[PDB]
Symmetry: D2
Subunit: 114 residues, 4 copies
């Protein structure tokens, strides 16, 4: 099934935050309406915040997360969870190798803000 | 029901990150085995990261998040999500006022690391 | 925080199903736009499916779950999970006593159907 | 990523329930420690319960759900959610066709019981 794709409410601010847990350099691209809106890069085996930004969902509300290591796309897992019918979390995990811990690049999207 | 309390696997390192979305200054305390292990503080209405840290779950694995604003504990909402039977997220939202957006302090715990 | 309340897609069919794990007789009420649409009841300590039904969410889409044992309201926990940006589960747990297993009446709401 | 595989606590009773939303007959296999423990089969486009049972997780705690339609394995989506650090849901969606509604056979695993 398709992973790493979420439909947010239109014209709404959201936060996007990436973590790294691998010996390979992670490249995280965040797409809004099929165009790159944010990009983060870095290497960590200690859960370093390789980037965090505030973006607008735009007219479409389509947000996609892609992860690659030196050009090679990582396998993705994702889900969305809503607490008390108000607070939203869009969660992404990625695997760049064989051990299947899926933490090599972890991406968290949260809304609403303010 | 009790919220913001999580049982992690014993002696496992986890990441903890806090965001702020309120007029008031947020104080986030992270407890391990019923003792304070980390404390974050700051103010933002733009989802700024007020703290991030790597901790150990210890012998018991019991981890608790508490949030205080303007001298009063915030109301908490929480849940744990596990993707592909490997990647764990422990999510916390909090409310300090009357609008019930529950984003005033957002806390994300993730494991395993490395 | 308010629990057991969910905003479903308007005018859409959903499935609601209840399980029982208590020595006390459970009563589950399902409200659609603030009016009782379904009621299930039973007594089992072995996860008996005391009721399953298909309902329409109506013009507003507001769905609420309430649980009571001998006329006393049970404490509720709830969350919504979305898989592959399409498949939805609204989950409810309830506690009628003091052991805090929160499984005394478990309610699962799923959509879309068909 | 692998889907439909869950690690439960050892020697623990759990409930497994399957729903159907497809013109094709759904066959659901539940494996405990890599051996078939339960099999459900049925057809519905109205979310009918095609089977429910209580099983023991055994010494390993490994539980796997498989879905097939007329011999053809369905693509699976899954996640585990824990409420108030006590109540566990293991959730499975499956797709047998081209529309990608992933509800053709829906499987809900819940624990603890009693
Ligand atoms: C330290 C390790 O780093 C990666 O493995 C090592 C690695 C480094 N670049 N690509 N890979 C995958 C193929 O070898 C990662 O997959 C593993 O979970 C650990 O975090
Ligand atoms: C068999 C037990 O049943 C309930 O407890 C016992 C019970 C029966 N009716 N109400 N109560 C709550 C006050 O005692 C329930 O809370 C507990 O988790 C077990 O499933
Ligand atoms: C009524 C429909 O039934 C299936 O489609 C029709 C069908 C019936 N058997 N296999 N397929 C897949 C290829 O045609 C299913 O995938 C779809 O979501 C609807 O529930
Ligand atoms: C700017 C406002 O500050 C406090 O009143 C919060 O309770 C609100 O959610 C909002 O963020
Ligand atoms: Ca890895
Ligand atoms: Ca890793
Ligand atoms: Ca607020
Ligand atoms: Ca706020
Ligand atoms: Ca109880
Ligand atoms: Ca019980
Ligand atoms: Ca389908
Ligand atoms: Ca279907």
């Amino acid at each position: 099934a398709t992973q790493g794709v979420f439909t947010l409410p239109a014209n709404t601010r959201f936060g996007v935050t990436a973590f790294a847990n691998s010996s390979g350099t992670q490249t995280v691209n965040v797409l809004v309406n099929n165009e790159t809106a944010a990009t983060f890069s870095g290497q960590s085996t200690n859960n370093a915040v390789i980037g965090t930004q505030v973006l607008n969902s735009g007219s479409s509300g389509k947000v996609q997360v892609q992860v690659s290591v030196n050009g090679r796309p990582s396998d993705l897992v994702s889900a969305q969870v809503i607490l008390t019918n108000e607070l939203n979390f869009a969660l992404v995990g990625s695997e760049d190798g064989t051990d299947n811990d899926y933490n090599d690049a972890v991406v968290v999207i949260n809304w609403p803000l303010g």
